[PDB]
Structure formats: C-alpha cells, structure tokens
Design a protein around this ligand. Structure first.
Ligand code: HEC
Ligand code: HEC
Ligand code: HEC
Ligand code: O4T
Ligand code: O4T
Ligand code: O4T
Lengths: 465, 473, 466
C-alpha cells in the first residue's frame, strides 16, 4: 500500500537557518555534500520543510523514470526569480530555460532542429573540430619550445577560451581569435561577469524578493551589474550577425543563430533571448567537465592509454570526416559519461510535478517540487560498483543511469554541442600529448549554481613525438 | 550704389559672453556650438555680430564673404591667439608652431615648411609611403574578414582608422613604421589619443574666458589641460629625439619622411623644427581620422554612390598599383566624395581672421582688427549654395570647373594660412578608401544621421557598426 | 713596524646620521660617490665607526691579495639580516649567498659542477646562443620596417627580457617567449618585485632589526611583500621542472636545475633555495653591464669597429660551435672586463675576516669587516692609466688581482660563467648585424640600490649594417 507524503523522512534542518548561513557565508559551497550526507542518513528519498510547499529529494534513476512519465506537455521548473527579475526590469523576453508552459514549448520546438537535432550537429561539428585542432596545435608549438618537450600549466584559462571560441563559431560562425592567443579584455570580463552572476544567484535564490530586497540589496545590484556585462557581450554577438544577414542571406551554413534568424519562426526578441542563453550557457558548462576529464586522465594513466589507442586508430577517419568522431570514439564518449557521473555541473534536476505520482512508494502530490541530486545518484555503489573508480568501461558493459543533461523534452538544449566540443578537444589532445600530474589528491567540488572544482591542478602535457 | 551700413547696424547675437562661460562651466563643454550658430544664422541672416563687451566679432556663412576675407588677407594673416595652448609653450619653454604663430615669425616658419609638407613635389615623395600603410590596412582587414564564415567582419572602425592615421602620419613625417596597423594598439598610442581628447575638451573649457577668469573659476581645468599637453609632448619629443639621433650619424640619400627633410635642410632652428614637428604629429591624428569615418558611414548609407566610386577605384586599380601618386589624378569621384564629406561634416567648423584692414561684408562695414568667423557647418548646409544639401552627392563637385564655385570648398581654409597638412590628409583619406573599395563592401543598418559634437574639432557623437563584406573571398 | 687599527684615518660621518639620511631619502643612491670621495680625501684605507664593530674600507688590488690569504676553508660575509628574516619567517632554507661556514661549503661544492664548471658551460652555452640569436633577429625585423633601416630606442626593457629568457632556458630549459614578443605580466611584476626588494634592502640594511622594526615597519612589509612575488615566480619555475622530471628523467641536457634535481646530492629544500638565488640573481646582474657595454660602444665607435671586425671573422666558427665564442672572442671578453671595471654591479666585495691580517701597514684584527670598493678600485689612475678611457686592449698586454668584479676565491660569483656567456653572445650577435650609435656622449650617473645600476637609460640607435 502507497504511503502518504507525510510518512517520508524529513530533512533535519530548516529554511531559516539555511537562509542565515547563506547570508553569512555569501554562498552554499557545500550544498552537494550536505544533501549527500542527508541521503546517507535518511534513505534515497526525503522531504524538505519549506513551511508550506512540498519539496522532495531523490537520487535514484528509477525515480527519474517515474518523473519523466509525469513530465506532461509542459514540464515545469521553479521560477528562477532573480534571473526573471533582470529580464522584467530591462524589458527582455525569456529564453527557453526561464520559460514555462506553452511559451516554453513554442520556443523549444523552434530551437531543437537547429541547436540539438543530429542534422544540425552534422553541420556545426566540422566547425568545432577546426577550433579543437587549433587548440592542440597552439599547445604543441609551446610544448616543443621547452627542452623536455612538455609544458606544465593550469589548463583552465585555455579550456575556457576554447569553449568561448568553439561555441561562438558554432552559434554565430565567427572566429574570435582566443584559441592560441592572449585572452581578450571582453572575454575575461565576460567570464568574470558569469562567475559573479552565478555567485549572486545562490545568494538571492534561497529567499523571497520580499526579504532579499532589504536583507541583501547590495547583492541585487551586484547581480544586475553582472547581467549588464553578460547582455552587453551577448547583444554585440547578435547585432553583428543580424546586420550581416540583413545585407546578404548566405548559401552555406554559418552557425546555429544564423539558421534561427533566416527561418524567422521566432520573433527577433525571442531569438535574442535564446541566443543569450546559448552564448552564456555554453562557457562554464562545457569547460568544467573538460578540466575534470583532463585531471581524471592524468590521475588514471591506464584509462588514458586505452582512450589514446582508440583516438589514434580512428584518427584518420575523423580527419577525413569530423562528424565520425561521435560514432568512432565510443570509449571517449563513455569517459565523458564517467566525468559527468562523478562531477555533474548540473547538481540537481528540478520539476514542479504537473500531476500526482508515486516515488519510492510515497504519494507525491501535484505541484510538489522534486529535485534529483546527481552527485549522490552517481556516487551510489549499488548502481555503480566501486563508484570512486574512474572507469569508462562501465558504460559499455551496461536506462536513466546517465542523466547529466536532464531528461525528456526539457533535456539540455546544448547537450549535443557540449558533447561535440568535449569529444573533439580530447581526441586532438590524446593524439599528440600525454597528460600527467603529481596531484593525486581528489579535487574538492564547490556549489556556485554550477558544480565547479574548487582548485585547478598543475597538468603536464608531454609531446608523444 | 546703396549705402554701406555701419558695424553697429548688424544683427546682434541674442546671448552674451558671461552666460556662455557660465554654461561652459556647468556643462564642462560647448558640444552644441555648431547647432547654436546655425540656428542664429537661420534667425538673423547670413551675417551677425557677437557681443564680446569691447572687441568686434562678426560671423559669416557665405563663400562670397570668404572671397572678400582673402582680399584683406595681408602678407601676415593673423588669427586669434589661442591663449591656453600658448600658455603651455611659454610655461615649458617651447617655441610656437605655425598654427600658434602670427606675423613675421609665422611667415618665416610657413615658407620653410610649405615645400616639404604641402608642395606637390613633397606629395610625390610621401604618397608611396602612405599607400603602403593603406594597403596594410585592407590586407589586415581581409585576413580578419576571411576567418569568419559569412566572409565579412562587423565592427566599430573608429579604433582601426585612428591607428591608421597615427601609422600613416608617422611614416610620412618620420619614416618609421609603428606597427599599429594590423596589430593590438600600443599603450603609448592609446594614451596619446586619450591625451588629445582631454586637451581638446579642456581647450573649449578655457578658451571662452580670459586668464583672469579661468584662473579661479576653473583652475582644475588648467591643470587637466597642461597634464594632457605633457603626454602629447612626451609622445612628440620621443619621435623627434629618434630622427634627430638617426640623421646625426648618417644623412640618407633617399626620402625618409617630411621631418627628415626639414632637419637636413636646417633652414629652421631645432627648436622651430621641434615646435612644427609637434603640430604635425598631433595635428594629423584626429583631423584625418574623423572625416575618413564619416566617408565610410556615408558610403554605407549611399550604396549607389559607393558602387560608382568602387567602379572608378577598380578601373584605376592597376595604374595606382604601378604608381601610387596617380591616385590624386585618376580618382576624381573619390576626391569629390571627400569634398562632400567635409561639406556636411567639417572637422574645422570655423575659420578665424583678426582682419588687418577695413572691409565690407554683406553691405556692412567691418573695421580693422575685427575678428571674423566663417561657420563651415552653416555654409555647407545652405540649400542655395548646395541644392538638396542633405543629399550626399560627389557629382556636385565635378562639372563646376569654371562655374565660380571656387570658394564653396574651403574646409582646409584659404590663402597662405590654408591648412599645412591639407595634401597629406587628402592622401591618407584617398588611399585608405581606394584600397577598401577594391576589396570590401561597406554596409550598415544605422541609416539615421550621426549627431556631431563640438570639442574643438567637430567629431561624431557616436561611431556606427559597419560591416565589411569581402567582394572576392 | 706595523701600525695599530686606531691609527687608520676614520670616515668623517657616523652610524646615526647615515641611518637618518637613509630614513629621509628612502635610499643611499650616492653611496659609491660618497666612498670614492672619502678615498680621495683620506687615502686607500680608512675605518668606519660602527660604535663597536671594526669596519675597514680598501680600494687596492694588493689589499685584495692579502684578503685572499686570510680566506679560510669557509670565507665569511656579513649576515644579510632582512633577506635571512624572510626565509626564517616563511620557513625556507638559505641559498649559497646567504649561507656561511660548513653549510655554505656543502651547498657550494654541489653547485659548482653544474652552474660554474667549464663542462657545464659547454652544455648551457648553445642554449644561451639560441636566445642571443632570437634577440638580434627580432631587432633586425623591427629595424628593417623603418625607412632609415635603423631603430632608435631604450634597450633596457629588451635587455631585461633577454636576461630573463636566457637564464630561464639555462636553468630550467624552458622558453618563456619573452624575446621578440610583448612582455608578460609575470615578467614585469617579477622585475618590479626585484626593484622594490633591492630598494627596501638598502633601507633596512644600515640599521639593526631592533631599530628598523619601529623606525621603518612599513619598509619591512614592502620588503616581504616584494619577496613574496619573487618566491611566487621562483616556486612556479621549480614546481614545473620537479613535476616534469618526476614522470621522465631525460637523456639529454635540459638545464642546470634539472641536473641538480637528478643528482639529488642536495635536499629538495636546498635545491629550491639555490634555484631561487639563481633565478632572481641572474636578471639584474647580467642586464646592467650588458646595457652599459652597449652604451660605451656607441660612444666608443673606434673600439666598436675593432670588436665587430673580430666578431665578423669568428662569426662562422661560432655559428658551427657556439662554445667557441669563449675562446675566439678575446677582445669582446676584454670589453666586458672594462665595462665591469667602470660599472661594477657588485660595488663592494665583503669578508668578515677569520684571522688577524695587515693591510696598508695597518693591523686588521680577526672579526673585522673588510669592504673592497670596486668603483674606486677600477677608477684608480695609477693602476688604470687614463681610467675614464674605455679601452679593452689594456686587458691584453699583461704584466694579477686587477679584475675582481665577480669576487675572489671559493666564494667568487657562482653565476660568473653564465653571466659572461649571456653577455658575450648577445653582443656578438648584435655586432654582426648592427651599428650601435648615440648622441648622449655625457657620462650616465650611477645609482646605488643594492646593485650599481645606471640612473638613466640612453637612447641607442641600431643601424642595420647592410
Ligand atoms: C644567478 C646567476 C648569477 C649571475 C648571472 C650573477 N651572479 Fe654574482 N653571484 C651569484 C651567487 C649565487 C653568488 C654567491 C656565491 C657565494 O657567496 O658562495 C654570487 C656572488 C657574487 C659576488 C660576491 C663574490 C665574493 O667573492 O664575495 C660578486 C662580486 C658577484 N656575484 C658579482 C657578479 C657580477 C659582477 C655579475 C654580472 C656581471 C654577477 N655576479 C652575475 C649568482 C649570480
Ligand atoms: C548551448 C548551450 C548549452 C550548453 C553548452 C550546455 N547547456 Fe545545458 N542547457 C542549456 C539550455 C538552454 C537549457 C535549458 C533546457 C530547457 O529549459 O528546455 C539547458 C538545460 C540543462 C539541464 C536541465 C534540463 C532538464 O531536463 O532539467 C541540464 C541538467 C543541463 N543543461 C546540463 C548541461 C551539462 C551537464 C552541460 C555540459 C557538460 C550543459 N548543460 C551544456 C544550454 C546549454
Ligand atoms: C599634418 C597635420 C595636419 C593635418 C592632417 C590636418 N591639418 Fe589642418 N592645419 C594644420 C596646420 C599646421 C595648420 C595651421 C596652418 C597655419 O595657419 O599657418 C592647419 C590649419 C588648418 C585650418 C585653418 C586655415 C585658415 O585659413 O585659417 C583648417 C580649416 C584646417 N587646418 C582644416 C583641416 C582639415 C579639414 C583636415 C583634415 C580633415 C586637416 N586640417 C588636417 C595641420 C594639419
Ligand atoms: C550547470 C547547469 N545548471 S542547471 C542544474 O540549472 O541546469 C546548466 C546547464 N546548461 C546550461 C546552463 N546555463 C548557463 O550556464 C547559463 C548562463 C547564462 C544564462 Cl542567461 C543561461 C544559462 C543556462 C541556464 C542555459 C546551466
Ligand atoms: C580642429 C581643426 N580645425 S581648426 C580651424 O580649429 O584648426 C584642425 C585642423 N587642422 C589641424 C588641426 N590641429 C590639431 O588637431 C592639433 C593638435 C595639437 C596641436 Cl599642438 C596642433 C594641432 C593642429 C592645430 C595642427 C586642427
Ligand atoms: C650585484 C651583486 N651584489 S653583491 C656583490 O652584493 O652580491 C650580485 C652579484 N651576483 C648575484 C647577486 N644576487 C642578486 O642579484 C639576487 C637577487 C635575488 C636573490 Cl634571492 C639573490 C640574489 C643574489 C645575491 C644571488 C648580486
């Protein structure tokens, strides 16, 4: 017999002590570890006391399957009040992430063919590969200047300028000149603006506008000033492509955003909104799991040689046809699944369930907030034997086990672009370099809206030839 | 004939010197000056007198009045003493350049400068150098353009155009490649450009009131002005110290710039060469730079005109490639397009002359010693002088040869005191545009008129987003 | 008959007025000229009143000779209290410069074979030559873009980025990409940190910690903040090479520091300490005599053509084998001896005498601090006929302790042969392609900021020869 909602284990804490500790610490850096500990202590399902609303936390793929069933025509997410507040203030339309209901479905169906569809990936994958090549060849040049034919560095800046370049070329069809050169003032300010926006989000996110208004008004300024820079960067991108297309409609493929603009299925204000989400949403999301793959490969050399052997065999066919990298690199794809399992940028999946459902034999009423904690999900030994072990082979021996890009209609729009940028950088890196590190210690993870590593390790890149 | 009316019979400007300075104190500038004077001409006629509470000041806007002004232009045409600029030079112990000199000292400097800066023989010598930089500008742009999928680059051209005018001028004056065209701007270049911007801003603030007033009303502006000049002179002295040392050890056979010829001739003192060299180094940046941009804008706005100029530049492309000095003669339309850009958008704004002997302008008696200002903005926008004045049409300057319109094109002034860098500016402007027209299509969605700002120079308020589409690719 | 210590003429000034003038001026820029004037007024030997300790000042090679014989198995220098204070505070070991006694000798003997030995010079010389070439070819490129086929500039920044690049490649075997490109934020901050550290040394150097701690505490902060930047730069260099070697021990030569790490004769903390002294101690030291040689050559065109003729004849053999530059450039080597004679970056040699000695017929007791002022020594009209005249040929006649800019004995400069290599090769490659010229014929004023550096940098023209 199905147990009532109230029968479920309750989180020991409270929404006020959480609020005050956030005001204090100016963040919630250990949210992932807090929830992971709660799951260890209470079970794979528990309810958070919001003093009225219903909030459930899950960590099982069987529970994600049940959630997808309830999804409905319009899967609902929680309204991200601080973000929506900026758009309302400056008079901008919302992108597909911040949209809900029919307006969301209208935007999404017009976006999927150009951003996510396999036909679209066939078109922008050769562009991504071009930037991926330029990354390794720039590195190789620097590596060969040193006597020991290797360069030791913090790869993070390079990886970020790669994700900026690769995304810009995929969206707008413009080479920014970031890969292989000194970072732009515009790029650094953009990267900093995102970092601040994400930090301030957490600060304003866990309390109503009515409270945060007077408790933290300085944070609201910080947040909006940060968005002002993100939008300044984004609008510059759109103003360029909109003028270029206005005078000449090209024959060939010149990016995702060009497609959207040419089709004119969405309004300019809708294209502007979604273009913003894609320009800013492609930077930190792709670059952090890439840094974590490079680290884990430098940590697990045995895995690195297996992936290198694969990348060297398939090297020739990928050189002739880049779009073959998706199919001819099954282990490298599996390594990325493993990086996202242990290090999810998207700590939790979120749905304000549209109808009643039953999770772990507990009644979950309609309107209930359901959060799928990916950190805990990926770290349960029952479903991932030896979960601490970085093993891509586990994804080849074996269904909702791999949900880092979400699920259903609402699943990550930039999923296939991110995978493409990640696969191709790594394929080109494995082909020429050996990634090595003395930092064998686990990198601590920090919650700043995105689950980012706290520290960047020193990585050696030894030239194979 | 009809009775010549006295000076006092002339319409008087409604405002006053005191309120004007109070406004400039408040606003920290006179950005609307051109529009203020243009409105005054609409309301009072083509001649009016400004009350300076003692001195005689007349304002004109007709070419017929410019003709009468040159008649009075003596052996030594003299202008108003630019007190703030002069003040810096006497404080730091520098000689004055032509622009700041008057009388015999001016004529002595001017006659020794004209053969190497302005003469056609000098233009034949520095033109191939300018063309070399003009080529490098387009080829650097083409490289950037071809990296993008749509084979076009959309940008604010202003920074590029400024680094072109700095590079082109430096190569023409000192025979040195600064490496600005096609590369990241220098800290020196950016600080120099900023220093000029500040100097021009502070000029407007101090030049509308006596030293007796500005010393207490705005002493902070005097500091701001001199600190700005300190940077301009630091840049300028570096240029001259280099060429002076280079020539001291080896006198070259070939042409290596304007300033090299002045130094080799030694007709002027080192302090006179230093003074004039400064005026030419700083005076060649913002001047050539703003009309060149307004041309790019107007062409992006007038595609019909652009294709006519491109067709011309493509036909003459081969002969200009063989001999760059042919660009002056073989590009008559592109030359007239520049006349049209300066007609609408004069970087000058006005021409001063503190008249040497009595004259009559618009049937009014203009006594000796009267300051006369020719407002070029108003002159160029006059519908009776230029039919459909808002229309950008280079063809209006072509079959006017022996039609009396000799005084309609006066953006570089007139007479002996006419702009010294006239022919260098025209060369930098023609050649950049010829090389740009040959490879790119200039396009813009910004069809709305750019507002002009008065900050000593008449500069655009905003810089538009311009697309440069590769014609070939 | 030998004269007592007290019989020696005494410096007119005092410990306290010195201290206060350094407090007021925030430096002792004129020290060299002060001591040089004192020698002119008092003789070639005088004593400084420290109000207890014995301090003697000398300027004759005969006195250096006598100092060498008193040099024990462990020659002593004065403990540089501010520097030692940083290492003690942050828990770092001391390098061979800051060490004394047996600990010094232990470090020294394990350093000499890889840093100073001729066998080591044969290994790092081709690396230095590679950077020296890149310097001239980068210059040539810029020179040829100008109409008069010459570039006029302040060479100082370029020369500094050369010493940084050349030293880094020699020590760690890493190309920093400084030569021929825009200076790094890291390099500029490093150069600035050194400048500050040296300035703040002079300020804290002439008074005890007991006093400097309250009379100038702000200076102690700026000194340590400066060292923090120097150590941040240095530690990155080490952390890179230590990780690189941990995964693969190379077959070929990949720098000085690599050979020390591979030998493991010294502890990692000892290698770190000495590696820091070599990384920071090779920037300013090589740069200033290099910049001064360029200056003296532009004002001595006659000398320049002699050195150029030599460098052009030997050009081919040096191209085939760079290590031949040491032997096949005797005049260029002699020009460097002349640059250091008039422009000693050292300024004064120092020894805390281990046993009694007699200098200039005066009794010098054990424990007495003896300072050899190289500026005055090199400007002595009686041993250097027409001392103000720049003449490399005076080092070739030979009739001997006249050339002591790298010190003397076991304690003689560890980076002597690396500095000479960087200096010779830059100049050889510059002489081969350019003519150095200047209108600045007037002597550059020298400044004392721990190192003897030129106060002003002159404008130097580099005319392409063909
Ligand atoms: C890092 C490379 C390095 C370079 C380059 C360098 N030095 Fe040194 N130098 C040292 C070190 C280390 C010592 C300390 C040796 C000791 O006390 O055992 C030293 C010590 C000295 C001493 C003290 C010697 C004594 O007998 O007391 C003098 C003098 C000296 N250097 C002069 C120079 C001069 C002059 C130059 C360049 C023209 C130079 N050094 C360049 C590393 C360097
Ligand atoms: C191209 C930009 C872009 C990139 C790159 C990107 N995302 Fe997304 N992502 C989005 C957008 C837009 C949405 C919102 C999808 C929606 O609301 O329909 C989204 C949503 C998501 C969601 C939530 C969807 C759901 O079912 O709730 C997850 C999880 C996610 N992304 C994970 C990732 C991960 C993991 C990466 C990188 C490894 C990543 N994203 C890279 C654009 C991007
Ligand atoms: C090479 C430097 C230089 C450049 C470039 C330059 N000028 Fe000049 N200009 C001068 C100098 C010098 C004078 C002063 C000549 C004199 O009055 O003796 C001057 C004077 C003038 C005068 C005053 C003439 C009079 O009769 O009162 C005008 C108008 C003028 N310039 C317009 C321009 C315009 C328009 C441009 C380009 C768009 C320009 N100048 C570019 C150097 C320059
Ligand atoms: C890490 C994960 N978080 S989560 C769990 O909430 O989906 C995530 C996944 N995909 C995309 C993102 N985006 C960003 O980075 C970003 C920046 C600026 C804007 Cl305007 C929009 C975005 C989005 C939300 C699209 C974020
Ligand atoms: C403003 C415009 N018209 S006007 C009629 O007012 O001179 C103009 C036209 N031609 C040349 C210039 N110069 C400058 O820009 C400049 C900068 C610094 C100095 Cl030291 C000297 C100058 C000059 C006056 C040469 C200015
Ligand atoms: C100029 C001369 N002065 S002297 C004669 O008093 O030693 C000298 C000669 N050789 C080397 C140096 N060094 C430096 O420059 C330096 C910088 C930073 C550090 Cl951590 C260590 C050093 C040393 C002392 C090695 C200084």
């Amino acid at each position: 017999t199905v147990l009532p909602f109230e029968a479920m284990p309750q989180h020991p804490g409270n929404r006020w002590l959480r609020l005050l500790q956030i005001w204090r610490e100016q963040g919630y850096e250990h949210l992932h570890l807090e929830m992971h500990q709660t799951f260890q202590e209470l079970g794979p399902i528990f309810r958070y006391n919001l003093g009225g609303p219903r909030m459930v936390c899950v960590m099982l793929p069987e529970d994600v399957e049940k959630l997808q069933q309830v999804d409905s025509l319009h899967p609902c997410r929680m309204i991200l009040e601080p973000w929506v507040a900026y758009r309302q203030h400056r008079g901008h339309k919302c992108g597909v992430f911040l949209l809900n209901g029919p307006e969301w479905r209208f935007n999404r169906l017009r976006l999927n063919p150009d951003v996510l569809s396999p036909k679209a990936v066939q078109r922008f994958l050769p562009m991504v590969d071009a930037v991926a090549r330029d990354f390794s060849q720039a590195l190789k040049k620097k590596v060969l200047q040193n006597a020991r034919g290797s360069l030791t560095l913090d790869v993070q800046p390079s990886i970020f300028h790669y994700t900026i370049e690769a995304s810009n070329l995929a969206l707008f069809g413009e080479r920014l000149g970031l890969v292989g050169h000194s970072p732009s003032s515009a790029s650094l300010n953009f990267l900093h603006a995102l970092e601040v926006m994400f930090k301030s989000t957490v600060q304003l996110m866990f309390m109503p506008r009515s409270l945060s208004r007077w408790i933290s008004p300085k944070v609201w300024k910080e947040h909006f000033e940060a968005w002002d820079c993100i939008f300044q960067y984004g609008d510059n991108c759109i103003q360029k492509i909109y003028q270029e297309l206005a005078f000449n409609r090209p024959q060939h493929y010149t990016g995702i955003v060009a497609e959207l603009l040419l089709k004119a299925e969405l309004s300019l204000e809708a294209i502007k909104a979604n273009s913003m989400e894609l320009t800013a949403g492609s930077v930190d999301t792709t670059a952090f799991p890439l840094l974590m793959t490079l680290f884990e490969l430098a940590r697990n050399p045995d895995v690195q040689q297996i992936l290198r052997q694969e990348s060297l065999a398939a090297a020739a066919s990928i050189s002739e046809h880049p779009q073959k990298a998706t199919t001819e690199l099954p282990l490298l794809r599996a390594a990325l699944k493993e990086t996202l399992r242990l290090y999810p940028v998207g700590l939790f999946l979120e749905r304000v369930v549209s109808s009643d459902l039953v999770l772990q034999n507990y009644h979950i009423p309609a309107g209930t907030l359901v959060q799928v904690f990916l950190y805990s999900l990926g770290r349960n030994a029952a479903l991932f034997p030896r979960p601490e072990r970085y093993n891509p082979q586990r994804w080849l021996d074996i269904n909702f086990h791999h949900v880092p890009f979400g699920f259903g209609m609402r699943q990550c729009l930039g999923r296939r672009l991110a995978e493409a940028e990640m696969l191709l950088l790594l394929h080109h890196v494995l082909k020429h370099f050996l990634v090595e590190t003395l930092t064998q210690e686990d990198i601590k993870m920090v919650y700043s809206f995105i689950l980012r590593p706290g520290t960047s390790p020193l990585l050696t890149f030894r030239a194979i030839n």
